[PDB]
Tab-separated table of C-alpha atoms and ligand atoms in Angstrom:
chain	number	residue	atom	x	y	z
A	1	UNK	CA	78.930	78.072	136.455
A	2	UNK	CA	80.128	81.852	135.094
A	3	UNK	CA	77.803	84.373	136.546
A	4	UNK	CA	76.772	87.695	134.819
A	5	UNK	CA	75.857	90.081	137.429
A	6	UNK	CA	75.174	93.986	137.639
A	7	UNK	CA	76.140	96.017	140.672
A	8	UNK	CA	73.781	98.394	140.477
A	9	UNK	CA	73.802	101.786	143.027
A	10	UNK	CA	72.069	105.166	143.327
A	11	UNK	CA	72.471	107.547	146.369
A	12	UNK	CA	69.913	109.898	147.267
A	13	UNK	CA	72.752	112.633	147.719
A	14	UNK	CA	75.467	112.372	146.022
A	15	UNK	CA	78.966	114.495	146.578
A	16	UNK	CA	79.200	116.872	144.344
A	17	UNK	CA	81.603	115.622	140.745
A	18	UNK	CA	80.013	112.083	141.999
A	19	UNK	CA	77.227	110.228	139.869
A	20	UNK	CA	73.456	109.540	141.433
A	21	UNK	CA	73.885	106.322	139.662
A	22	UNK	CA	76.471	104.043	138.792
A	23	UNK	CA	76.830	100.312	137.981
A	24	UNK	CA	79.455	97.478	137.476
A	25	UNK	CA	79.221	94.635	135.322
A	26	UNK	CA	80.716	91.768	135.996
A	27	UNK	CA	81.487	88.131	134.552
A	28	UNK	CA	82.433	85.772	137.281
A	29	UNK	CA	85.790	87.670	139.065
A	30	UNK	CA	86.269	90.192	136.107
A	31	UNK	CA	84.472	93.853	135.774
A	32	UNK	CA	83.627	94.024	132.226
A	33	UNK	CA	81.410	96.711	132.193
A	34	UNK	CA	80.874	100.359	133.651
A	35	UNK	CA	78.036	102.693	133.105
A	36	UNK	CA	77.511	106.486	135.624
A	37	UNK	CA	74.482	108.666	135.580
A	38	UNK	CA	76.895	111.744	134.810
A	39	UNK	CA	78.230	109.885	131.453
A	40	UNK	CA	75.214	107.864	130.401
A	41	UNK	CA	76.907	105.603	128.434
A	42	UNK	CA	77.874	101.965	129.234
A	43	UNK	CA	81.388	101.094	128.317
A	44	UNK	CA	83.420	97.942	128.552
A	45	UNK	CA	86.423	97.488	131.012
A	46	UNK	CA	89.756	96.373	130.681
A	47	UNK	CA	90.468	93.296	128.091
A	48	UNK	CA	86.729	93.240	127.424
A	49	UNK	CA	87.198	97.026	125.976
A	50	UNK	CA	88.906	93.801	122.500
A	51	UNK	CA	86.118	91.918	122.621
A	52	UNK	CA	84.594	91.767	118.621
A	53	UNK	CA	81.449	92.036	119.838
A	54	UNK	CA	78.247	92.682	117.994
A	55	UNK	CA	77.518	96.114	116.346
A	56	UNK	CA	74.657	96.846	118.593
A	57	UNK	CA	75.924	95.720	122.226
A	58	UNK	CA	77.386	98.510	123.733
A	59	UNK	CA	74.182	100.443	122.860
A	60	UNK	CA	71.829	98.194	124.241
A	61	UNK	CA	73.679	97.839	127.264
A	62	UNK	CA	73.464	101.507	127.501
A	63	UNK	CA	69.403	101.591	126.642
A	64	UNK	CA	68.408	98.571	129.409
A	65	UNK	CA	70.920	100.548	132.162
A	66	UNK	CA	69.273	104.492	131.339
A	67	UNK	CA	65.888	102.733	131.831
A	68	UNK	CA	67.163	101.436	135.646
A	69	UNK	CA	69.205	104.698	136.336
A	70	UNK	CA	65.289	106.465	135.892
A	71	UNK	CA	64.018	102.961	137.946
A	72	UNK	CA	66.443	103.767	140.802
A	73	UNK	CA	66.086	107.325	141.312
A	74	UNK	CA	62.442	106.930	141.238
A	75	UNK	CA	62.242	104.981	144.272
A	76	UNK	CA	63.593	108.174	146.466
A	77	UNK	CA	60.429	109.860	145.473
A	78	UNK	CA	58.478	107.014	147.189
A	79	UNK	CA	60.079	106.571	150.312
A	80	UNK	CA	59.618	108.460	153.774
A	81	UNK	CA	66.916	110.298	154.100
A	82	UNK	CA	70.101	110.254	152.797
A	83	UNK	CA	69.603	106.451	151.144
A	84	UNK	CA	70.802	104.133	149.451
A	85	UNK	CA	69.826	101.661	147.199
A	86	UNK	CA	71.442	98.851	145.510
A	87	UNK	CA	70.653	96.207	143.330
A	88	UNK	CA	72.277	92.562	142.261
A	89	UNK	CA	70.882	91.636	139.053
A	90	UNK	CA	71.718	88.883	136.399
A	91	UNK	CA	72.354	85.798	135.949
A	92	UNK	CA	74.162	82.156	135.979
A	93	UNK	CA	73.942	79.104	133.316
A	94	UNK	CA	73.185	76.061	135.754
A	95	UNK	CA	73.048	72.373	135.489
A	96	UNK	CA	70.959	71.538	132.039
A	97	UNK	CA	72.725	74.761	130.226
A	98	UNK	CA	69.701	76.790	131.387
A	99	UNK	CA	69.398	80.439	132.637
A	100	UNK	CA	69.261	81.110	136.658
A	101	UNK	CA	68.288	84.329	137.708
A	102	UNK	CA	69.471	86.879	140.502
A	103	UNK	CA	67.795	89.701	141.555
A	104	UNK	CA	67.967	91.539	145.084
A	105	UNK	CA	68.214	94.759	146.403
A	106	UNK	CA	69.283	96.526	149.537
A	107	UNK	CA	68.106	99.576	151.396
A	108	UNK	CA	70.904	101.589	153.009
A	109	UNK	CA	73.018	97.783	153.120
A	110	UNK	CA	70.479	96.331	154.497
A	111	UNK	CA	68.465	93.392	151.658
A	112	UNK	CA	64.949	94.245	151.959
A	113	UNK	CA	63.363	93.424	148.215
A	114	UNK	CA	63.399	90.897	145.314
A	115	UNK	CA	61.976	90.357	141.988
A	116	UNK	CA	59.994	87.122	141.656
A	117	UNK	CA	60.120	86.299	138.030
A	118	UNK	CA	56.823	83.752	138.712
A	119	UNK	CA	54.749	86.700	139.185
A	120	UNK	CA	56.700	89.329	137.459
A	121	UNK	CA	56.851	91.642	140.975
A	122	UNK	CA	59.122	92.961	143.635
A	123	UNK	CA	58.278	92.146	147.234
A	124	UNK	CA	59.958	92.540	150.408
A	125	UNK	CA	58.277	92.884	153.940
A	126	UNK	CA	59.161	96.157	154.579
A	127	UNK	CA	56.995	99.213	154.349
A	128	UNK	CA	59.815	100.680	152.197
A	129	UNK	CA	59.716	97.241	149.875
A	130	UNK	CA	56.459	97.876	149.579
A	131	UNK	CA	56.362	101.572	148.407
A	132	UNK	CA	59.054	101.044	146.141
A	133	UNK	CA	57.560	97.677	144.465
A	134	UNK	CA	53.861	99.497	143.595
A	135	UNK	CA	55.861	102.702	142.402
A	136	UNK	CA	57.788	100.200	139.621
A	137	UNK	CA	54.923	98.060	139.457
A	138	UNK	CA	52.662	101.209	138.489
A	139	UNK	CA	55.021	102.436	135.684
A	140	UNK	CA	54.030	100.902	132.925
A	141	UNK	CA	55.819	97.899	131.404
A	142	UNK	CA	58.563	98.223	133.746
A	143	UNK	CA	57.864	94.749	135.539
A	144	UNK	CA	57.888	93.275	131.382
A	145	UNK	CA	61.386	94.901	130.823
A	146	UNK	CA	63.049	93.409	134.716
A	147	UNK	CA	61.628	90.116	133.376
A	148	UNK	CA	62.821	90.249	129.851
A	149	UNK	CA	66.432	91.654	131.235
A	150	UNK	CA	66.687	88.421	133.074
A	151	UNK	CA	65.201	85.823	131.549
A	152	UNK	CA	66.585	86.951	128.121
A	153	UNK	CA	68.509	89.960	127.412
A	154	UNK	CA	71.377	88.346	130.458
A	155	UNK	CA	71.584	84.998	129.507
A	156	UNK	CA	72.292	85.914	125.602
A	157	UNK	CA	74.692	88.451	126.473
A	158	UNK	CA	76.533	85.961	128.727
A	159	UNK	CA	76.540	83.240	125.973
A	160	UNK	CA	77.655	86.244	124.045
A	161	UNK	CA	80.867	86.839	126.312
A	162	UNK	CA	81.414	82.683	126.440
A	163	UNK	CA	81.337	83.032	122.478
A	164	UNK	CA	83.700	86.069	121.747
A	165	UNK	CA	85.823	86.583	124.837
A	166	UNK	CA	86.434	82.955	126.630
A	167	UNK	CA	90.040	83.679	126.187
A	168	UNK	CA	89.401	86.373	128.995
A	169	UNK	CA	88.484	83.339	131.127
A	170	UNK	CA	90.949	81.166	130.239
A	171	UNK	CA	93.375	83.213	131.445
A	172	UNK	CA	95.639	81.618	133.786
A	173	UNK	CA	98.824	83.566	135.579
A	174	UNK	CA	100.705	81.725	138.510
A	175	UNK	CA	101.594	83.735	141.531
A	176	UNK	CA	104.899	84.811	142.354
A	177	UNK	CA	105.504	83.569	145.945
A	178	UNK	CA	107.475	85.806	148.956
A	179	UNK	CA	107.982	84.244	152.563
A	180	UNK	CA	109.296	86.734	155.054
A	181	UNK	CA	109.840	87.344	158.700
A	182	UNK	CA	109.661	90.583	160.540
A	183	UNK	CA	110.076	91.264	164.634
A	184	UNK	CA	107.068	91.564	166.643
A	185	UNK	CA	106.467	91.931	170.129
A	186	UNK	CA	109.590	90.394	172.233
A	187	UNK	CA	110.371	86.539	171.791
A	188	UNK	CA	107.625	86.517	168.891
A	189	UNK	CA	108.091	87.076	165.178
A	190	UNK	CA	105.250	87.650	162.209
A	191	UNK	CA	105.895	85.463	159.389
A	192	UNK	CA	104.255	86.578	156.093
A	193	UNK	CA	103.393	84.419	152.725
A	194	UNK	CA	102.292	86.448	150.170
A	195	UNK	CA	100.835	85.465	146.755
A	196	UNK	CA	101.547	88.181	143.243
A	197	UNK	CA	99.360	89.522	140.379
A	198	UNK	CA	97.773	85.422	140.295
A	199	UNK	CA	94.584	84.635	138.020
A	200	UNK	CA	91.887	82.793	138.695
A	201	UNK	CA	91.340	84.545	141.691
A	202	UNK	CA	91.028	80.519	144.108
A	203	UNK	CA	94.017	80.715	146.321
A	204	UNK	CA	94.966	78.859	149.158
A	205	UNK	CA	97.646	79.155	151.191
A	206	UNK	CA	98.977	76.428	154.298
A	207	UNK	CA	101.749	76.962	156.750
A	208	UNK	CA	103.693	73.819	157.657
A	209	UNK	CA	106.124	73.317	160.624
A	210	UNK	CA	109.071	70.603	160.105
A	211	UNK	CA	106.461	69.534	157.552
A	212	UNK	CA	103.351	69.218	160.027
A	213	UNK	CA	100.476	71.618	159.465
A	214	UNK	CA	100.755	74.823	160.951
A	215	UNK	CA	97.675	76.129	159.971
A	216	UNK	CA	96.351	78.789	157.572
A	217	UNK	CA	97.152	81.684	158.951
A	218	UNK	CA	95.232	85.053	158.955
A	219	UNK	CA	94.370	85.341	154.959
A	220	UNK	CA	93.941	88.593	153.800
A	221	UNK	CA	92.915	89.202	149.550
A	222	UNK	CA	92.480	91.809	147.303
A	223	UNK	CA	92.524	92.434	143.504
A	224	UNK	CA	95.384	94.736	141.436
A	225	UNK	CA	94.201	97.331	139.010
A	226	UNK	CA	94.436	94.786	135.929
A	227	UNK	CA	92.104	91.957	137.628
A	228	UNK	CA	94.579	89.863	138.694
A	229	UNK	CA	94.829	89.495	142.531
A	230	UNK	CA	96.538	89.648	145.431
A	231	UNK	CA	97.005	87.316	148.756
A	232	UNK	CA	98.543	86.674	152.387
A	233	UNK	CA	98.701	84.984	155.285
A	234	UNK	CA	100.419	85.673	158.393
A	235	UNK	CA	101.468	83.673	161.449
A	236	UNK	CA	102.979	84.475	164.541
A	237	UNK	CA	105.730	81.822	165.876
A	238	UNK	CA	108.541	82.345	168.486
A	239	UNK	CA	111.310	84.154	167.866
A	240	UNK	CA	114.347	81.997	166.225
A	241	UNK	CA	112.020	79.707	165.308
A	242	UNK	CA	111.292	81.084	161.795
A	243	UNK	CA	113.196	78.905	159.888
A	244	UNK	CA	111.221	75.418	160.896
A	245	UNK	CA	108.636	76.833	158.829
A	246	UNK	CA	107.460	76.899	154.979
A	247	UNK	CA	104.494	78.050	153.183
A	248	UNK	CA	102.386	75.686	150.651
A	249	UNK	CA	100.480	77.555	148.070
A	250	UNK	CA	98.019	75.869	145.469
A	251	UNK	CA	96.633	77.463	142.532
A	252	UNK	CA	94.849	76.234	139.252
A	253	UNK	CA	97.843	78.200	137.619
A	254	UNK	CA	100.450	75.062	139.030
A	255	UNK	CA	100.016	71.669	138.364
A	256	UNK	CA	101.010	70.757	142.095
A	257	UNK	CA	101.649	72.936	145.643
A	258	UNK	CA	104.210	74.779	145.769
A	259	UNK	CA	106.341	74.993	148.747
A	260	UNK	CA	107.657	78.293	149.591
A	261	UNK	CA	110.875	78.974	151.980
A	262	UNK	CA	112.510	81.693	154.182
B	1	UNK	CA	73.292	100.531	158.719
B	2	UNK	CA	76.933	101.783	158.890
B	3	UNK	CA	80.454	99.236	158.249
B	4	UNK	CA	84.163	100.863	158.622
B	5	UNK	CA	86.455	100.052	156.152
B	6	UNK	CA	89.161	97.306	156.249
B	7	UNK	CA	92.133	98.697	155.230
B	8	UNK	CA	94.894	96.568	153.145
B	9	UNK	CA	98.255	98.269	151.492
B	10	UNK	CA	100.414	96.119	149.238
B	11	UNK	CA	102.280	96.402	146.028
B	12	UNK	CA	101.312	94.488	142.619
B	13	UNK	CA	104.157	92.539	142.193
B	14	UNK	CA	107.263	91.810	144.744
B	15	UNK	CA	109.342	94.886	145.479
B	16	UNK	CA	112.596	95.328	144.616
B	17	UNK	CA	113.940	98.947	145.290
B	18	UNK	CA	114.621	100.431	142.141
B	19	UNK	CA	112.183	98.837	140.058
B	20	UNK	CA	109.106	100.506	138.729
B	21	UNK	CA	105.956	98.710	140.450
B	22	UNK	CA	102.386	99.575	141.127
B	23	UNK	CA	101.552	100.296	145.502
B	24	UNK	CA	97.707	99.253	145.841
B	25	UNK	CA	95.236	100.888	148.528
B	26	UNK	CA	92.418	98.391	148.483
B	27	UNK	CA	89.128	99.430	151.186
B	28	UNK	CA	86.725	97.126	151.745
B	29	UNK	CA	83.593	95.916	153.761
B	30	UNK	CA	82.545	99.785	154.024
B	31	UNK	CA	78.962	101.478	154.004
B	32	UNK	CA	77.598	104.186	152.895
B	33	UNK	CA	79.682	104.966	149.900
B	34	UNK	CA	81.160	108.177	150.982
B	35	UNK	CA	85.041	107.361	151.549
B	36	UNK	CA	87.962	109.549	151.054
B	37	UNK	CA	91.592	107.525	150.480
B	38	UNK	CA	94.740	109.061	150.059
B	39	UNK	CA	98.306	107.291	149.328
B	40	UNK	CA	101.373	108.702	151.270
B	41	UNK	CA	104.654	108.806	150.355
B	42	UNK	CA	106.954	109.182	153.615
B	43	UNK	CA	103.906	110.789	155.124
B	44	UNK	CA	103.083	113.364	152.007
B	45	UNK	CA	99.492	112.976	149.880
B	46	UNK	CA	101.054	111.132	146.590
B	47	UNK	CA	98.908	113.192	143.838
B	48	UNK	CA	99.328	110.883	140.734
B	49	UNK	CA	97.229	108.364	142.031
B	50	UNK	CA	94.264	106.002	140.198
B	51	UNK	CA	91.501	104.114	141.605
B	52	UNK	CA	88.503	101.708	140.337
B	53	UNK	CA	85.003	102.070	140.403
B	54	UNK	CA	83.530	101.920	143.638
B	55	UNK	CA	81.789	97.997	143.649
B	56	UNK	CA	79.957	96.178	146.486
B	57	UNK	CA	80.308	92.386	147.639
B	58	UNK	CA	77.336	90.073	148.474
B	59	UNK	CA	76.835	91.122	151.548
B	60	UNK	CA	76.435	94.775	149.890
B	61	UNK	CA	79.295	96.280	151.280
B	62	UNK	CA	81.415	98.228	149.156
B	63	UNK	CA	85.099	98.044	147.762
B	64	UNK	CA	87.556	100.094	146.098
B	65	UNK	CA	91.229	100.051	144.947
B	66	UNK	CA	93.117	103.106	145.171
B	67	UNK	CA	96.962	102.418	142.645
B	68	UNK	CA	99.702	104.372	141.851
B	69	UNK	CA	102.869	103.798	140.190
B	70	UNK	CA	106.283	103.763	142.265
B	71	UNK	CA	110.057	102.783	142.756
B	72	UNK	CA	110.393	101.256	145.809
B	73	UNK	CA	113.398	102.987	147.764
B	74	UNK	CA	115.065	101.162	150.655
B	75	UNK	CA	114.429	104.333	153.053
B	76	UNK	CA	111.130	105.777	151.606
B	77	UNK	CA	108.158	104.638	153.633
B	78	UNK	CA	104.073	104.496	152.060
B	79	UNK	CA	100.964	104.685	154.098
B	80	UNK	CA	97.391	104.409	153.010
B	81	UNK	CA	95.038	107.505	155.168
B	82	UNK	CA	91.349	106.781	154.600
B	83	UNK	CA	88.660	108.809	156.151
B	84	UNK	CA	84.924	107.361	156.380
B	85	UNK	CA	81.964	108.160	158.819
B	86	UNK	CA	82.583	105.296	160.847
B	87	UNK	CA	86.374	106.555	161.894
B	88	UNK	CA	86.852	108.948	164.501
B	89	UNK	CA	90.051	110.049	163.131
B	90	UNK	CA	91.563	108.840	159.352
B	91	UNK	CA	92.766	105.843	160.037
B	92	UNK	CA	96.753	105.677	158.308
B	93	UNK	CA	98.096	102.083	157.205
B	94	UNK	CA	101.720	101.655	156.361
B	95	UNK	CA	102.457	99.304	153.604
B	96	UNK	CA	104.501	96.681	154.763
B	97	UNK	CA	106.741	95.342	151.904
B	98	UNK	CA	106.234	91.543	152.858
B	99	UNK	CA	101.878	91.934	152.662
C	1	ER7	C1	90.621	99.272	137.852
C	1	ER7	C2	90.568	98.052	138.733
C	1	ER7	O1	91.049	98.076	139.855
C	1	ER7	C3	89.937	96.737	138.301
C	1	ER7	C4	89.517	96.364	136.903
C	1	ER7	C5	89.679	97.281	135.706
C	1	ER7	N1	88.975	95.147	136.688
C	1	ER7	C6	88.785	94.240	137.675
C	1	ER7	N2	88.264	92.994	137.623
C	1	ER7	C7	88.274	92.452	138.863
C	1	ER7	N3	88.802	93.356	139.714
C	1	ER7	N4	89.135	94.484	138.954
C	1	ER7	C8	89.700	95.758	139.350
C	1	ER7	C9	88.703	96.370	140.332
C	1	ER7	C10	87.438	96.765	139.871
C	1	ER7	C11	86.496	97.323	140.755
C	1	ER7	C12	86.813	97.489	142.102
C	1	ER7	C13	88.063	97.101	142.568
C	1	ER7	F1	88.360	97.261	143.864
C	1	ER7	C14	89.011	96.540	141.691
């Protein structure tokens, strides 16, 4: 159920220093891949950067993201800005170990176009889905090359990653657990669990009262600059009161919950 | 259409003042792409400071970590200022040691 996906975005403007078009590659939680318009070269990210992979990948990555970079910028030409455009391409290995496509794409954050591999053309019901679709679907063989990306070219690269860098995915670190209390407003104190540097990014985390659920909390999430992540929740109880309280956190990293005190 | 930021300031691992540590801007949930993020140390811009590429969630908003490297202090106190075009003003978000 891994998913290889491409964050693809070009701005019709861009701040000067800044690229026109840059994408993000990603398998499941963790970026492996980064490509700009100002370098023009696709690199890998992180742990990936050791992956033994095959003489030819990095290049090919860079060939099939130049060809979008000239895709995306075209469709300014067609339309009516500042814009922007993104795209979500890739794809998943389902149930019956075969290939499941994405591919969507946003106007200015708004979805507005797809690629439907059964006809091999993008479609949306907007006028600007519209423009945009018969300006790729004029230039020649550039339907072929969105349908051989993801029917072929993303579904061997992924079974490329599950063959030379699994270990990536394996990776399991347990969060280091804090449960604090600070003053709030009078009679009322904030109390805050927070979750460490975990991996795989599924989290949850439970308050309990003298052992009764307590509820979740407000859950907040975010990653750290290696991939591994970041989580709290916060609660607000009365004043004095903190210490009837303890936070549960479960995580594919521990066997069991882990109960967290003051 | 236009979504502010959400704004979240916390460090990599727990702090303990005197240790060497990472202090992590992440902005979220924002569009367009233009943002400007700067981490403050006691209310000055902090100018050896890292970030990630600029990605975008399902729901194509886009995301962005902001990290630099610290000591936690007892006294010294770190904000997070971001400016976007949704914000009237940049918006400043202490860290708070237990997030
Ligand atoms: C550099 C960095 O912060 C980083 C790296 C290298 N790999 C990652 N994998 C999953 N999150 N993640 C982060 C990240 C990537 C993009 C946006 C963001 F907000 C965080």
């Amino acid at each position: 159920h891994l998913s290889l996906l491409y964050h693809l975005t070009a701005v019709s403007s861009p701040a000067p220093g800044t690229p026109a078009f840059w994408v993000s590659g990603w398998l499941g939680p963790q970026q492996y891949l980064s490509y700009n318009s100002l370098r023009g070269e696709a690199e890998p990210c992180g742990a990936w950067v050791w992956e033994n992979q095959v003489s030819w990948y990095w290049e090919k990555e860079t060939t099939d993201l130049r060809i979008k970079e000239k895709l995306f910028l075209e469709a300014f030409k067609a339309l009516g800005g500042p814009y922007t455009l993104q795209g979500l391409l890739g794809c998943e290995l389902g149930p019956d170990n075969t290939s499941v496509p994405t591919a969507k794409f946003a106007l200015n954050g708004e979805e507005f176009m797809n690629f439907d591999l059964k006809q091999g053309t993008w479609g949306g019901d907007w006028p600007e889905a519209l423009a945009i679709s018969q300006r790729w679907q004029q230039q020649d063989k550039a339907a072929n090359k969105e349908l051989t990306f993801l029917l072929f070219s993303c579904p061997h690269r992924l079974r490329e990653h599950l063959e030379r860098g699994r270990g990536n995915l394996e990776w399991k670190e347990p969060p280091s657990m804090r449960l604090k209390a600070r003053p709030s407003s009078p009679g009322f104190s904030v109390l805050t669990c927070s979750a460490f540097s975990f991996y795989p990014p599924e989290l949850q985390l439970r308050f309990l009262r003298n052992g009764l659920a307590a509820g979740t909390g407000q859950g907040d999430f975010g990653p750290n600059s290696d991939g591994s992540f970041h989580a709290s929740s916060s609660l607000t109880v009365k004043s004095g009161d903190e210490h009837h309280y303890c936070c549960i956190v479960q995580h594919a990293g521990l066997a069991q919950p882990l109960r967290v005190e003051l | 259409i236009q979504r502010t930021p959400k704004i979240q300031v916390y460090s990599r691992h727990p702090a303990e003042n005197g240790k060497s540590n990472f202090l992590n801007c992440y902005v979220s949930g924002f569009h367009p792409s233009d943002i400007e993020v700067d981490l403050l140390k006691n209310g000055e811009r902090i100018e050896k400071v890292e970030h990630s590429d600029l990605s975008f969630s399902k729901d194509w908003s886009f995301y962005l970590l902001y990290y630099t490297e610290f000591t936690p202090t007892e006294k010294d106190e770190y904000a997070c200022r971001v400016n976007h075009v949704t914000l009237s003003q940049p918006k400043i978000v202490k860290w708070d040691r237990d997030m």
